[PDB]
Design a protein around this ligand. Sequence first.
Ligand SMILES: O=C(Nc1cccc(S(=O)(=O)N2CCN(c3ccccn3)CC2)c1)Nc1nccs1
Ligand SMILES: O=C(Nc1cccc(S(=O)(=O)N2CCN(c3ccccn3)CC2)c1)Nc1nccs1
Ligand SMILES: [Zn+2]
Lengths: 319, 160, 271, 249
Amino acid sequence: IPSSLPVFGEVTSGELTDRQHKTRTLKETLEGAGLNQAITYSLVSKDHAKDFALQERPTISLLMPMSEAHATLRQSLLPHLIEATAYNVARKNKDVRLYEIGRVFFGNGEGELPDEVEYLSGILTGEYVVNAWQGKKEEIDFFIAKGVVDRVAEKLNLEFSYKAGKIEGLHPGRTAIVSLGGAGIGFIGELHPQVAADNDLKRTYVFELNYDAMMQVAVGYINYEQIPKFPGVTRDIALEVNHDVPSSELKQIIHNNGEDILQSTLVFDVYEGEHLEKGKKSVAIRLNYLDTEDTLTDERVSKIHDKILEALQAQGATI
Amino acid sequence: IPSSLPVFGEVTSGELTDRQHKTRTLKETLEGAGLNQAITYSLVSKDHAKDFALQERPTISLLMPMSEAHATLRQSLLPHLIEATAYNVARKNKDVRLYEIGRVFFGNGEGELPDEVEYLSGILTGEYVVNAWQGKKEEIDFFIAKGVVDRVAEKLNLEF
Amino acid sequence: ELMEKLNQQLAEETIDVTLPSRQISIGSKHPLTRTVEEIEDLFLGLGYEIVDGYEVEQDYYNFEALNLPKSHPARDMQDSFYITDEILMRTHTSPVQARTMEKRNGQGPVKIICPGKVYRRDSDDATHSHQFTQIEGLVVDKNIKMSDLKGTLELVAKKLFGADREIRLRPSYFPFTEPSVEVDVSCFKCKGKGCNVCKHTGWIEILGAGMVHPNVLEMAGFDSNEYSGFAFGMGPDRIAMLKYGIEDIRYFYTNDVRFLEQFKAVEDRGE
Amino acid sequence: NQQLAEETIDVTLPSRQISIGSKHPLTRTVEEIEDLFLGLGYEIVDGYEVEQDYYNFEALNLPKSHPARDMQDSFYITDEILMRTHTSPVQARTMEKRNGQGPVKIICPGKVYRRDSDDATHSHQFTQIEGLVVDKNIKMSDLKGTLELVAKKLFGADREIRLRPSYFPFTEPSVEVDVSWIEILGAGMVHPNVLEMAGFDSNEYSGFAFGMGPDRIAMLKYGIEDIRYFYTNDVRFLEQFKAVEDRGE
Ligand SMILES: O=C(Nc1cccc(S(=O)(=O)N2CCN(c3ccccn3)CC2)c1)Nc1nccs1
Ligand SMILES: O=C(Nc1cccc(S(=O)(=O)N2CCN(c3ccccn3)CC2)c1)Nc1nccs1
Ligand SMILES: [Zn+2]
């Protein structure tokens, strides 16, 4: 048999689909942030199969497992990523950053194919940045884990929002639900202290995201906006508020009252200590104002800024 | 006119060369570390054309420049990267991270085509990491610029 | 005033530039993903589509549609992970090609590549994992010949193992294809006369391939008097093992960072 | 007990950003076009930015006499050497090395230079992508087909385009393509003198070629108001290009 190549008369350019291309770019982004690509077993133990699941959805078990530890299809990527972390840490690999894109499996009742859903997940523990001789040591915390989930959203041109959530197996105090277009798509959280202790881990952060939901969003082309011709105005405010008010709440009040010129808002400090009524915190927020069509008079800014202050004051937020 | 696509009887896989692939990859890794890809003008003032040259070699000047700013081919990517940085800073963008891959040009004299050399360069100032509520503010210093070069070498499997 | 501070800077601000740089860490691409991507790239430049589908699959697509009637020695409940009598963890990526074929309603060309996780009812050890990766291809058009298969399998061996790779085609049998072969690449280590990689053979098995069997074409909705096909499969796990000398399959699925973080950098073809 | 309550965070507080650089929008448009042509079997070829007038002009069917070779419009360095005015010389040089044997199917991106004052629509250094197909029975319909793919890749598939007869020295017949109307691609069947000069037999081989300008494509696609923004490198410009794109909704 001589050697030849097939010549295709329907001519078509071979290209990644859009989803395929986005997935490669996303994996470049995760990797570029220090996360190693994991690949885990789909099959877990039957009592692990529902860990970190969102819905009660039925699980899929094999008829004849080769092995109790690989008996049911996972409804979450995290159990085996946590195991891989425990494994690494017991080998004295203290700095573990892993991500996975992989499928999870929810049962469609009996004799139907399950719902296979693609997830992006990852797990993080140890130092994010080290240079000992310069005193640099940045421990991975919730907010760096958040920073990874945000770098995802940023790269895909999405916006996520975050609201405290209770997920079994995560730290009740350090778990957020991640939402896209007002729908829950996942979560980010420190592991429960008890789960971490079981696995002999330190502070460890996981995130899991419905990547199918993410990929359904049509983002189009990038929206280019010319650089503003005129300078904006920044005002800072320090808002005393009950300790449990999320900063999102105050930011929303500000946007709600910011009319045409309020561009963005940034918390730059939170203070809880003795210099302040117990059960209060002081949250400092930088308000940025901007008109693309005109220069800002102190007085136009003050007018709205005063409206914003009042709305805040009336919702229990003392200056 | 009918619309058709040509069918090549001689069949080949269209693929990036090795070098083309390293380049796309290296660019992602740069972008991944927070550097924006710059593209600058090849032509500088005759006065800047020899800046940072390694390299004592003849420059290549245009017969008929349109601008004194654009009269001679650069032997370094930095003059115009520094220029872009200054620009940004004057416009109050205090944090500028730029890399460029592009050519510089060395005279072979005497109506010969110059040596065009592909360079990788970049320029870095301001903060690398911030999160103010947490008090994180990590200024770009020489050892972050070093980390960027080491990430380049790391990625390309080079030993610098 | 200014020259005086400039000079004090100059005098004061010398650093040992050999000191550790502030590292900006790169994570790795999994070695199995790397091999899968280079094969996709190769096929993209040839006009193919990369296609994904279900990992839990129906007997019909996993087996029947692929010319394993309810009879057969591979349908075997002991060799495959069933969930019901009808539904199993797919044993190869063929069912995805079979389904895509079917939706083409007897119209070509088909030219697809299907990478993904596959499953065997097997105890694990240095050389067996119950969940592994496969890349299949399927090309179906009008005058497809086995020489066209050969030429394509050759680009595959070059892509994976170097421009100087030859292939070797050995008679074999699979139920979905006919003629069928197993395919060796010449050894990329030893140039001829043998080493431990090719087991002093010169030839390393890496692929199976064959001309698609009429029954498979006809079941998909294609006319096998007008259409012919070829298909092939390979194992990224085995390939990466051979390529890198990785000695235990399970290293791929443990995600030791001291294994993973080995695979950060670009590659080329040396000389 | 109190442990969990004392370690409560505000999960809505700013995350620790791990910043992403951007790919230049000119580079984005380039890559996209490369990826299109890769999947059809083309090679991306890269060549000299400073060229001989033979390759930049002569080999392109612009004899000594031509208005195109005017020293006022191009950036010469000697009477024989100049900043190339297009990436055609790389395509002409690639052809000659093929030695009368096709197929050629190449795409040639890169910086090109024009002796002109810069303003909002003109930069003395800009980018170009050229392509060349040479093979035995290349016909203009084959050109048309490829051009529609290019347009489809750049501006999506429903975007309306317009083909207009026109004229360039190095091709005949020739074409311009507008997108809904704005001109973006120039192209033609390669002129036989051009095949004949780089050593193909124009009785056996025909060709088609095209050029487009990513600076212009990008300005049009995004409504970038001044081409010089591409070469100024204000970060407030570049950072608008971090994210992926899809076709859309
Ligand atoms: O035909 C194929 N694939 C194919 C062809 C030949 C060899 C191989 S292979 O090496 O990967 N194989 C995998 C499966 N193995 C099996 C599977 C079942 C029975 C016997 N042995 C043998 C090795 C794959 N796919 C198609 N999809 C649609 C129509 S045809
Ligand atoms: O033939 C081409 N390309 C080509 C074909 C038509 C139009 C254009 S274009 O729109 O980019 N162009 C650029 C040049 N312009 C010129 C230049 C000189 C004279 C007239 N007009 C017109 C617009 C490019 N190049 C070849 N290289 C090797 C062999 S053939
Ligand atoms: Zn050998």
